[PDB]
RNA sequence: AAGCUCGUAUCAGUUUUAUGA
RNA sequence: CACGGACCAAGGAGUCUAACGUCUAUGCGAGUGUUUGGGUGUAAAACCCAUACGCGUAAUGAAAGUGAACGUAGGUUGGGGCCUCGCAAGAGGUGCACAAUCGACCGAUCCUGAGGAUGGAUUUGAGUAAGAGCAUAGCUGUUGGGACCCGAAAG
């Protein structure tokens, strides 16, 4: 009546068509298989925390965080430097303010520590 | 009750075990849906073709201008080659650029609705146990006991 | 005016074939309207909600009538109580099928209706809102 | 400026003919079709 | 962000297998806890009547008429913290 | 289990096999029904005699 | 409820530091104006 | 350790 | 071209009668 | 008139795509869309899928804000069908979609003075008034791209 066509530039030079969608899925699965073949008994990814999303819109939702904290790791009963060797992602810049999020993470860490089998250095 | 299908043994005998129809054979057999889903699905395993981007542009031709009793088509400059003074850059020209060069960003794969796709797959199963559509499709199925044909798990 | 429908559905072609027979034979003005309605397009047959059927049964002296829809019957969330009648249509949405069966009534096809009402007796034809949409 | 009709020795040239002049107009039959239709537009819209 | 929700719906959020138990034997104090924040709706509005079954509504915002229509049916409107 | 039925669900998230819009695949059988043939007015010649 | 968070850099904002006050004032007098 | 995208 | 009505009493480069400067 | 056309072969011009739109077909339907990804695969095919997201289900106002049932969702006027009577013509009841007119609610807009109350009158809207859309495909239209094919006084 509206329409805006951004074809005033030399658009025909930069046209990326993703024919390799099927090729790149295979490529990532081969990558995962290789990583799991090198990291044999371990999962494939670090233990990630539970986290509340920002903004009025999404604060209903609970999502994965980057890492726990020095606080959540200490309350679980271990050190940050040792947590990384057991494959627990640690976030130094994140803060602890909500009690429900805190306790959920501590129990996630505690249940993780019961389920694991750490190998000795010998 | 969905009638029963006599399972056959690997030797070719009627095993007393009979199994009810899985109600997939009682789906609507739609020739129109199976067709219009098939065309889209058959387009999916398809590789891109395109002519070269530089094909018909690797020439330094220029028009001779009007008024010279010759066609206005752009002509190769220089001399002493035979290619000099002969038409380029057109779809009509020999060694010239094709009309609307084929590109890779043509649509190759076809998006189909998922329940529509499952409609066609259910209808296709439904038509495997018809015995007259099996003869219409091809398949020499005169000298067999019953359809749907079922063999024992030891297969 | 149309000879053969724009539809490629073989089952819709069979219902058209059935009602062309009944519309030319029985000379009842039911079958002529039904067979006219099957030649219409998608925009020309809007869906009849289960709410409109509920209205048509609240209707005075229209309790035990067999309601006929030539479009599709759609489910509704705004109603809570549904009467105990037989509904004839082309397609029923899974929810509306569930609602009609739960209430106690039957949900029948159009050929099933053609056996039950060949002259189109005790029937009521509802069509959906057209000019409501653009 | 002299009008050189492209016929005979003048037909089909890349550049200048034998006729020595600074400015010259090489001229066709197809040139008539254009310039006649460029007058048909001019004589109607003026 | 403010997605709206009519009182004409209001029961779609309750799963359909539970709705038979709730609609039958309409007893007070034992009401369905309808969570609209988790459902993905900000404000509650009124498009029509609900049955006489008690209803608990938890929302960021409600209308006057939507508040009144639940109260007349015998249900509470819990403004969230 | 893969496709579902009247009893079993589907194993596919929110899927049900489609419904027939006509019950019987045969129409001539439905024409031969007792109630229809009782409401039907008698048939003509099928092919007309050439008067004049 | 609140969980009394860990202290940061500019919360003890400009911690006095007896030595740097001395150094700044020490250079101030030496360098002139 | 995170719940995967998709269907197992 | 498409949908919805009535397939009609919906009308007509026409005549008549009456009304007309 | 003029312009093209000595003859033959082969090549030789409304194509692809993006965006938006009409009509039709199909799937599902107050929902709808798997294919960003993940799982799986006999391996670019096919077959499954969690979480979100898009458009729609609510609009109005500049924004703050507020937010669509007094009634069997409303009265009157028509209305395909259907129903009762009619040996038939016809009368009456019911009235679907839809069309006109008088009303109820939402929104902003003033008196009433209970501060802004009960009620009063219109204006606005692609309003509510018991949803109709989402997706794919086909014919196709408009606009942008070299854009039906060849040609221009060039910077």
Q: Is C7 exposed, middle or buried (0-12, 13-18, 19+ CB in 10 A)?
A: middle
Find all residues with CB under 8 Å of F24, minimum gap 6, and list them: C111, F30
Task: Give the CA A5 to C1' J22 distance in Å.
Answer: 21
Structure determination method: cryo-EM
Helices (H), G1-33: 18-30
Torsion (CA) D14, D20, D26, D29 in degrees, nearest 10: -110
Under 8 Å between Cβ of F19 and C90: no
Q: From the C1' of J93, which residue's alpha carbon is nearest?
A: C61
Angstrom distance (rounded) from CA C40 to CA C130: 12
- Indicate the SS3 state at residue A102: helix
Residue C69 phi, psi (nearest 5)? -120, 135
Angstrom distance (rounded) from CA B73 to CA B57: 14
Which tokens hold the place of B93? 């020209």
Cis omega (within 30 of 0) on the bond before F14? no
Q: Say what the resolution is, in angstroms.
A: 3.3
In chain C, domain spans:
1-132
Under 8 Å between Cβ of B7 and B17: yes
Q: Count of alpha carbons within 13 Å of A69, Cβ hemisphere only?
A: 18
Angstrom distance (rounded) from CA D27 to CA B69: 8
Task: Give the CA A15 to C1' J92 distance in Å.
Answer: 74
What does each C-alpha distance from C7 to B29, C40, C71, F22 come to in angstroms? 16, 9, 14, 15
Q: Which of C77, C78, C80 sits opposite E51 (nearest CB)?
A: C80
User: Which residues are registered as beta bridge partners of C108?
Assistant: C88
A 10 A CB-CB count for A119 gives 7
Residue H2 phi, psi (nearest 5)? -85, 145
Q: Which residues of C touch B123 (CB under 8 A)?
A: none
To the nearest whole Å, the CA of G8 is away from the closest chain A CA by 11
E-state strands within B20-124: 61-62, 75-76
Mutate to test the interface with C, among B32, B35, B130 (most CBs of C within 10 A): B32
Which tokens hold the place of A51? 């986290």
Q: H or E stretch including F7?
A: none
* Helix C10-25 × helix C29-37 angle, to 10°: 160
Which tokens hold the place of A90? 């640690």
Which tokens hold the place of B155? 């297969």
Asked if B144 has any chain A CB less than 8 Å from its own CB, the reply is no
Find all residues with CB under 8 Å of B93, minimum gap 6, and list them: B73, B87
CATH C-level class of C1-132: alpha beta
Torsion (CA) D21, D25, D29, D32 in degrees, nearest 10: -140
């Amino acid at each position: 009546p509206i329409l805006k066509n951004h074809f005033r530039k030399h658009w025909q030079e930069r046209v990326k068509v993703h024919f390799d969608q099927a090729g790149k899925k295979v490529s990532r699965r081969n990558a995962r298989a290789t990583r799991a073949a090198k990291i044999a008994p371990r999962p494939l990814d670090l233990l990630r925390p539970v986290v509340r999303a920002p903004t009025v819109k999404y604060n209903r939702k609970v999502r994965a965080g980057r890492g726990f904290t020095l606080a959540e790791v200490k309350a679980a009963g271990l050190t940050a430097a040792y947590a990384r060797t057991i494959g627990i992602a640690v976030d130094h810049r994140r803060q602890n303010r909500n009690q429900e999020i805190f306790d959920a993470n501590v129990q996630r860490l505690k249940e993780y520590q019961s389920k694991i089998i750490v190998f000795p250095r010998n | 009750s969905r009638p029963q299908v006599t399972v056959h043994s690997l030797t070719g005998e009627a095993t007393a075990n009979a199994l009810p129809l899985p109600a997939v054979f009682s789906a609507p057999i739609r020739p129109d849906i199976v067709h219009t889903v098939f065309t889209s699905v058959n387009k999916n395993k398809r590789q891109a073709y395109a002519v070269s981007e530089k094909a018909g542009h690797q020439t330094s031709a220029e028009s001779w201008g009007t008024g010279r009793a010759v066609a206005r088509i752009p002509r190769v400059g220089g001399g002493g080659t035979g290619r000099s003074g002969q038409g380029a850059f057109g779809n009509m020209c020999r060694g010239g650029r094709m009309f609307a060069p084929t590109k890779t960003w043509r649509k190759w794969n076809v998006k189909v609705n998922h329940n529509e796709k499952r409609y066609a797959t259910a209808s296709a199963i439904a038509a495997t146990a018809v015995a007259s559509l099996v003869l219409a499709r091809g398949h020499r199925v005169e000298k067999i006991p019953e359809i749907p044909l079922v063999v024992s798990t030891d297969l | 005016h149309r000879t053969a429908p724009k539809s490629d559905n073989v089952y819709l072609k069979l219902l058209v074939k059935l009602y062309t027979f009944l519309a030319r034979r029985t000379d009842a003005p039911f079958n002529k309207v039904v067979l006219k309605a099957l030649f219409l397009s998608k925009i020309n047959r809007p869906p009849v909600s289960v709410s409109r059927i509920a209205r048509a049964l609240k209707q005075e002296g229209a309790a035990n009538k067999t309601v006929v829809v030539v479009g599709t019957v759609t489910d509704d969330a705004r109603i809570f109580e549904f009467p105990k009648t037989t509904v004839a249509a082309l397609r029923f949405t899974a929810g509306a099928r569930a609602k009609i069966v739960k209430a106690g009534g039957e949900c029948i096809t159009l050929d099933q209706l053609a056996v039950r009402a060949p002259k189109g007796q005790n029937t009521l034809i509802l069509r959906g809102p057209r000019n409501s949409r653009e | 400026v002299t009008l050189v009709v492209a016929s005979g020795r003048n037909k089909g040239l890349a550049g200048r003919p034998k006729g020595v002049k600074g400015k010259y107009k090489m001229v066709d039959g197809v040139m008539k079709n254009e310039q006649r239709a460029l007058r048909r537009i001019a004589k109607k819209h003026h | 962000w403010k997605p709206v929700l009519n009182l004409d719906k209001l029961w779609t959020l309750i799963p359909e297998d539970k709705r038979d138990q709730y609609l039958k034997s309409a007893s007070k104090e034992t009401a369905p806890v309808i969570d609209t924040l988790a459902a993905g709706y900000g404000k509650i509005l009124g498009k029509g009547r609900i049955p006489n079954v008690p209803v608990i509504v938890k929302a960021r915002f409600v209308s006057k008429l939507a508040e009144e229509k639940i109260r007349a049916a015998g249900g509470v409107v819990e403004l969230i913290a | 289990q893969v496709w579902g039925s009247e009893t079993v669900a589907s194993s596919k998230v929110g899927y049900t096999l489609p419904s027939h819009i006509i019950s019987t695949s045969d129409v001539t059988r439905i024409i031969n029904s007792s109630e229809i043939q009782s409401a039907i007015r008698p048939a003509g010649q099928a092919t007309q005699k050439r008067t004049h | 409820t609140s969980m009394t968070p860990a202290p940061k850099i500019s919360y003890k904002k400009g911690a006095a530091s007896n030595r740097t006050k001395f150094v700044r004032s020490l250079v101030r007098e030496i360098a002139g104006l | 350790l995170q719940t995967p995208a998709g269907g197992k």
